[PDB]
Amino acid sequence: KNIESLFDYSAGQFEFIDHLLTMGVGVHFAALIFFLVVSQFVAPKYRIATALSCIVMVSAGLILNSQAVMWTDAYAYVDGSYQLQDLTFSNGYRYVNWMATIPCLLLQLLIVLNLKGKELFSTATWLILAAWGMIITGYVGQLYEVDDIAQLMIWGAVSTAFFVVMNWIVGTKIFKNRATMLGGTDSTITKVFWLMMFAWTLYPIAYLVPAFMNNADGVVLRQLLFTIADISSKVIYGLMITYIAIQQSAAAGYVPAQQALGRI
């Protein structure tokens, strides 16, 4: 049901996709160790924001790892090209994983925005419901990326509605609570918003690849887009969230944070 199944791949195409996913694994697990060791310099009220980056690194790292082994499982070099065998490859498992990873990305944002208690719970709940609506309708949509492009588009429109509403909640909370933020991170958080808008928008672009580039090179392009998007939305994003957590920790008088920033 996925366009990947439609084509044979050159050694070049096949190896490049393998390398993309493997590099993705390496980058996420490398970052994981960074978030782990810096977590001790985060104040208790923000430390979970850095823990969530660890959780995202392993979750995303495992899905990329799974995609890579699925890739090599599904294809074998036969008569001069990589051809589909008995096992299958699908991006559908990415969508399932988003059900967990996207709430984590959203939660660590709310935490460094200094949301607490009832507002935290209510905002998270609405955000997670919006995200799940987006992911599920998008998941259903890509089931038709071969059989019914029209249906892919309509489900994608519904998904984009959830996407836009979710982004509006994110933007609203960021620009409203920006003033509460310490150590100059009121400026930093604005770049985080635009990073999210940029990086997250790469995913619906990848979703539409079967509509504007239905060939083996389009398959490569989609994986390339996922790689840019994953690294930007999880790794670069996590580094900024953690930077914001440490800076605010130091500004609130957390001594390990102050000492850590002093060494650099």
Ligand SMILES: *C/C=C(C)/C=C/C=C(C)/C=C/C1=C(C)CCCC1(C)C
């Ligand atoms: C780490 C993974 C992330 C941040 C994934 C984010 C995914 C999206 C923003 C997906 C958006 C979609 C649309 C807005 C329309 C097409 C269907 C989706 C689910 C791909």
Ligand SMILES: CCCCCCCC/C=C\CCCCCCCC(=O)O
């Ligand atoms: C934050 C951005 C992260 C970027 C990650 C991607 C790094 C490698 C990107 C690709 C370089 C272009 C490779 C050439 C493609 C050759 C075409 C092919 O052989 O199929």
Ligand SMILES: [Cl-]
């Ligand atoms: Cl604290």
Ligand SMILES: [Cl-]
């Ligand atoms: Cl993920």
